[PDB]
Every structure is written in C-alpha cells, then in structure tokens.
PDB file of C-alpha atoms in Angstrom:
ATOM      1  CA  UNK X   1       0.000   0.000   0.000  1.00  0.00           C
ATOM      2  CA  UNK X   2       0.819   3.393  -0.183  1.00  0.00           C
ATOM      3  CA  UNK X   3       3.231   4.726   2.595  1.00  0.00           C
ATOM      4  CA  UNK X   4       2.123   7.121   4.830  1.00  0.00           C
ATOM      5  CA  UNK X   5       5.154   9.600   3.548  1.00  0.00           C
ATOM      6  CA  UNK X   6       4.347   9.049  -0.065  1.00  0.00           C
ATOM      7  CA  UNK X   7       0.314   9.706   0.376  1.00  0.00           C
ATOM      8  CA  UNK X   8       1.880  13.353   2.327  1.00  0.00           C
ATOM      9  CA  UNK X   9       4.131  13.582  -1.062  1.00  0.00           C
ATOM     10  CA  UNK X  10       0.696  13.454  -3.108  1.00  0.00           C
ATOM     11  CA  UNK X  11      -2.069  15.412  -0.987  1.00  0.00           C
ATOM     12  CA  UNK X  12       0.374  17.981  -0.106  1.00  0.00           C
ATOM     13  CA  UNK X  13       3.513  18.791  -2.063  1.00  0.00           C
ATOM     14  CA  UNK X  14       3.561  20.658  -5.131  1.00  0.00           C
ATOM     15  CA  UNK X  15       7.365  21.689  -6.059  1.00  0.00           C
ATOM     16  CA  UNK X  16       6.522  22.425  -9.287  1.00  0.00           C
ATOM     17  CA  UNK X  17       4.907  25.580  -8.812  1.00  0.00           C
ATOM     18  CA  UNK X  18       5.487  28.804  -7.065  1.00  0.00           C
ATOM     19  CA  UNK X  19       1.662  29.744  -6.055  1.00  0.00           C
ATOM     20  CA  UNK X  20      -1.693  29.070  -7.568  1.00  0.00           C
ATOM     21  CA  UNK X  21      -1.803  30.344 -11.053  1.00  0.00           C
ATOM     22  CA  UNK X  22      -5.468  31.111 -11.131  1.00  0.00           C
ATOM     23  CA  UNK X  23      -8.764  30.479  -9.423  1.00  0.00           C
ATOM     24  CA  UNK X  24      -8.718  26.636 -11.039  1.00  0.00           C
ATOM     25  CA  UNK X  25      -5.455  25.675  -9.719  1.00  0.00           C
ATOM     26  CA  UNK X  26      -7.439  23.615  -6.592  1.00  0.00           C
ATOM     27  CA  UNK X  27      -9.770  21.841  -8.848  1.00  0.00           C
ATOM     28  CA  UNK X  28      -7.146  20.849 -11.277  1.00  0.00           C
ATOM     29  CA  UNK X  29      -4.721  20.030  -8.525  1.00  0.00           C
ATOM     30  CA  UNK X  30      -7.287  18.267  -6.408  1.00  0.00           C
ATOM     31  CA  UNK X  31      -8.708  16.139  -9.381  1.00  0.00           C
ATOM     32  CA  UNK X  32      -4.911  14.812 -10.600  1.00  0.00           C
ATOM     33  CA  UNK X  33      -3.641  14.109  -7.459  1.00  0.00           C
ATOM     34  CA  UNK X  34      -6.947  11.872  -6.685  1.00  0.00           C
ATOM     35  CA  UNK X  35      -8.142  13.521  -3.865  1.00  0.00           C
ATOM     36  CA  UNK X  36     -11.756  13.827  -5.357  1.00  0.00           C
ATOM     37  CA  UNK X  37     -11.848   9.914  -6.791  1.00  0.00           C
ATOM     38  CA  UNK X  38     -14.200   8.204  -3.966  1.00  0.00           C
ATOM     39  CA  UNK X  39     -15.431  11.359  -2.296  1.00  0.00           C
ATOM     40  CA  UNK X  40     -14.819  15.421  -2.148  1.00  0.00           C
ATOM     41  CA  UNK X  41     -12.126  15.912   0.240  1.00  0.00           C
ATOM     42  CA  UNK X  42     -13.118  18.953   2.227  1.00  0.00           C
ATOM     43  CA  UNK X  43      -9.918  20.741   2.460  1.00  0.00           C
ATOM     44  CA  UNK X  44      -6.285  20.133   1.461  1.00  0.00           C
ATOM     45  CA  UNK X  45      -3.124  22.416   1.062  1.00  0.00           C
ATOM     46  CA  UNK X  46      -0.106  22.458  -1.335  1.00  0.00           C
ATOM     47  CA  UNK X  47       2.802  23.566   0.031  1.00  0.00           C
ATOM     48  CA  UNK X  48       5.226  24.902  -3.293  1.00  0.00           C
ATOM     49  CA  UNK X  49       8.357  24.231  -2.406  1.00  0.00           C
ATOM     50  CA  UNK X  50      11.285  21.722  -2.941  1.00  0.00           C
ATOM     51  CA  UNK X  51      10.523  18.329  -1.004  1.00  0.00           C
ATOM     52  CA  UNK X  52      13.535  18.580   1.110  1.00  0.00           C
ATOM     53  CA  UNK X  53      12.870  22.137   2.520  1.00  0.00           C
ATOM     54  CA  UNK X  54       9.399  20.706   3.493  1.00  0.00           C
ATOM     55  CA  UNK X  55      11.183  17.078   4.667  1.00  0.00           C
ATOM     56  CA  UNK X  56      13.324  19.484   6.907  1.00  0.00           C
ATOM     57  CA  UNK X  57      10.449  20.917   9.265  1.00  0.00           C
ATOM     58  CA  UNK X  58      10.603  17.300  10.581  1.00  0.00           C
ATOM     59  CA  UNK X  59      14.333  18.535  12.637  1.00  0.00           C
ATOM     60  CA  UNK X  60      12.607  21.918  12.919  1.00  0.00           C
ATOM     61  CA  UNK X  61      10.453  23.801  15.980  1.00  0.00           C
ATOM     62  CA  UNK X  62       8.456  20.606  18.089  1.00  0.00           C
ATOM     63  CA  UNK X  63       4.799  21.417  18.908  1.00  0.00           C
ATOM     64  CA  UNK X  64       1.759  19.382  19.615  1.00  0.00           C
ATOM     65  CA  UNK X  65      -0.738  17.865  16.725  1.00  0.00           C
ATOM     66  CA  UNK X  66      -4.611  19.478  16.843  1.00  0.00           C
ATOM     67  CA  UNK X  67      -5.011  15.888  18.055  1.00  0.00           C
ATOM     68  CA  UNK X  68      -2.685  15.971  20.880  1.00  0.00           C
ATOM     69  CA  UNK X  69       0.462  13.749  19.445  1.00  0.00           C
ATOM     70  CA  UNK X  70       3.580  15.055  19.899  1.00  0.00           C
ATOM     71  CA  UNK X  71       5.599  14.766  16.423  1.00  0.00           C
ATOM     72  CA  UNK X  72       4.197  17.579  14.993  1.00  0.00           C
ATOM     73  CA  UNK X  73       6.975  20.076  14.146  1.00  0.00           C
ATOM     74  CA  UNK X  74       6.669  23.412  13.208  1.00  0.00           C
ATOM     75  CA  UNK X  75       8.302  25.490   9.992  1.00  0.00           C
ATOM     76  CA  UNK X  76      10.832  28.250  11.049  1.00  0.00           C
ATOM     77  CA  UNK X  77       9.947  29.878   8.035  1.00  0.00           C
ATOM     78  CA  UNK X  78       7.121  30.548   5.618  1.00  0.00           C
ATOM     79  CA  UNK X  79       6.298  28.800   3.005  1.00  0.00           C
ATOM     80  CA  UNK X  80       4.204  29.419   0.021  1.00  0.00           C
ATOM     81  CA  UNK X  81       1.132  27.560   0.236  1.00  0.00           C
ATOM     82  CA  UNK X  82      -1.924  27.275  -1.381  1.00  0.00           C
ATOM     83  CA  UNK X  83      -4.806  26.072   0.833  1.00  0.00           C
ATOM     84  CA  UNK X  84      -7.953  24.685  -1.144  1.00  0.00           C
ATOM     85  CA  UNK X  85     -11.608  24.192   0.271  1.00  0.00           C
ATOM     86  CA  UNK X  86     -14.837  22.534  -0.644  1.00  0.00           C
ATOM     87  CA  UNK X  87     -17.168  25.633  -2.330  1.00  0.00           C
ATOM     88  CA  UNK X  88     -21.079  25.653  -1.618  1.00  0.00           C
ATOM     89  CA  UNK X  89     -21.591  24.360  -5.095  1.00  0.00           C
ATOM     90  CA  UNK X  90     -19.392  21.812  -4.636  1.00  0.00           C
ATOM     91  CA  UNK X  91     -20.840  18.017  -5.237  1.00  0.00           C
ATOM     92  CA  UNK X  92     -19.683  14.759  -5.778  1.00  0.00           C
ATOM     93  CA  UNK X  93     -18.032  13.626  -8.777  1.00  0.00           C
ATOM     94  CA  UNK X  94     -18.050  17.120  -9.786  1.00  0.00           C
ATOM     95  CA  UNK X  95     -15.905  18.455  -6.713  1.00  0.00           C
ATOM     96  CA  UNK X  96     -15.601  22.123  -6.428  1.00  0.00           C
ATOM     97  CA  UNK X  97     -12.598  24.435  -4.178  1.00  0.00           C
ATOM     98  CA  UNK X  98     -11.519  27.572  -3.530  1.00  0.00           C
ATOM     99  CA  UNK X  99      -8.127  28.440  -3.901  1.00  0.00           C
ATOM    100  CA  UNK X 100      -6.295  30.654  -1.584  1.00  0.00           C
ATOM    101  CA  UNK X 101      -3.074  31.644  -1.979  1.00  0.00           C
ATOM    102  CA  UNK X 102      -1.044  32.542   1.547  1.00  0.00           C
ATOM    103  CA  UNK X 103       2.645  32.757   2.866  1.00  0.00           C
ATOM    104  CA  UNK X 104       2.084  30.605   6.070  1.00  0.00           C
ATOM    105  CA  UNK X 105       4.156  28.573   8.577  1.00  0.00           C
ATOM    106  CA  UNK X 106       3.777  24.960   8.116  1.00  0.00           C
ATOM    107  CA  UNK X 107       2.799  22.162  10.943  1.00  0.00           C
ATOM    108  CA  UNK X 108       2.902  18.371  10.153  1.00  0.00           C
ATOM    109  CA  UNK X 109       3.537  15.102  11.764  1.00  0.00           C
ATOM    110  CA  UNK X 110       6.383  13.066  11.157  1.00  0.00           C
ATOM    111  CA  UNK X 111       7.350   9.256  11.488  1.00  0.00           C
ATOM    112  CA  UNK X 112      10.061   6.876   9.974  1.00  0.00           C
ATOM    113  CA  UNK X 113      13.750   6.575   9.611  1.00  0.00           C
ATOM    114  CA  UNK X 114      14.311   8.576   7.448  1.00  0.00           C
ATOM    115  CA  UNK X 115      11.925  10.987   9.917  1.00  0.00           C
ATOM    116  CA  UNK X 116       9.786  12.638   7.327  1.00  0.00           C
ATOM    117  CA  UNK X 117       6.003  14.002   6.874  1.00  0.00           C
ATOM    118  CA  UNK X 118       3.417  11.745   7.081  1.00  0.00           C
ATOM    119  CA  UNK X 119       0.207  14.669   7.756  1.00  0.00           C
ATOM    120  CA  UNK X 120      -0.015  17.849   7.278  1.00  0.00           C
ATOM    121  CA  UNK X 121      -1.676  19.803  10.699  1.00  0.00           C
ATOM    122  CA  UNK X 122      -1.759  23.188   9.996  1.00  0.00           C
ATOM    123  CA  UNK X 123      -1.111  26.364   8.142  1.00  0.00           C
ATOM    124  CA  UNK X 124      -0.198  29.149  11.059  1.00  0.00           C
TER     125      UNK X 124
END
C-alpha cells in the first residue's frame, strides 16, 4: 500500500509551482492528485516548495498535533502555500474548491527513519 510519507508527497507537495496560477489551480490540482476519486475531500493544502525544505520541518520547531500527538513540528519559516476548500456548489463527482493563496508557517507530523512528513496539521 501506499506509505504514509508518499500519500503526504501526493495530498500535499507541489514543487513544481510557485503559487496558484489562477482560481482553477485547486480543482485541477485536487482532481490529478486523486483527492476527489471516492469522495470530495473537504480541504487540502499544497505547500510549493522543494521536497527537502518541506522534509526538513521534521528537525525543525516541536509542537503538539490538533489531536494531541507530539511529532508535529513546526516550519521556522514561511512557506508558500496554497490552501484549497470545498465551495457551496461543490458536489460529488463534480468536486468544487476555492483556492487561496497565503505565505504561512507549516505544521505536520512526522514518522520513519528517514523521519519525514506523514500529515499535514496546519497552516499558522
């Protein structure tokens, strides 16, 4: 099955970009990276930049999960980001986000040797 730090590499990286291009990047990005297949996923953020500056949060500031666990790790910097959620229109198969473009800090879990991402907690 997929591995916890490859389905983070999916939902949430997008290196290849700098920012959302338009109001369409969420759809588009949301659709090809299968996030809409079986169900809408309510909200989801890219985080555009190279994998290893996002791998590196996971040596970066410690703070608690929204659940409580305690390998969350905060960004020292900002990242771009692009945070996408559901729209009022939006219904399955034909999924519909907005796409928000922010400079944010970064919060995810990590697990594994290597000690990588494996969620993505929060935009702060």
């Amino acid at each position: 099955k997929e591995t916890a730090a490859a389905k983070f590499e999916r939902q949430h990286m997008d290196s290849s970009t700098s920012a959302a291009s338009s109001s369409n990047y969420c759809n588009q990005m949301m659709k090809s990276r299968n996030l809409t297949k079986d169900r809408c996923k309510p909200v989801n953020t890219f985080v555009h930049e190279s994998l290893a500056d996002v791998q590196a949060v996971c040596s970066q500031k410690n703070v608690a999960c929204k659940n409580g666990q305690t390998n969350c790790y905060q960004s020292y910097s900002t990242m771009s980001i692009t945070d996408c959620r559901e729209t009022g229109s939006s219904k399955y198969p034909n999924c519909a986000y907005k796409t928000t473009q922010a400079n944010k800090h970064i919060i995810v879990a990590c697990e594994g040797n290597p000690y990588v991402p494996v969620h993505f907690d929060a935009s702060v």
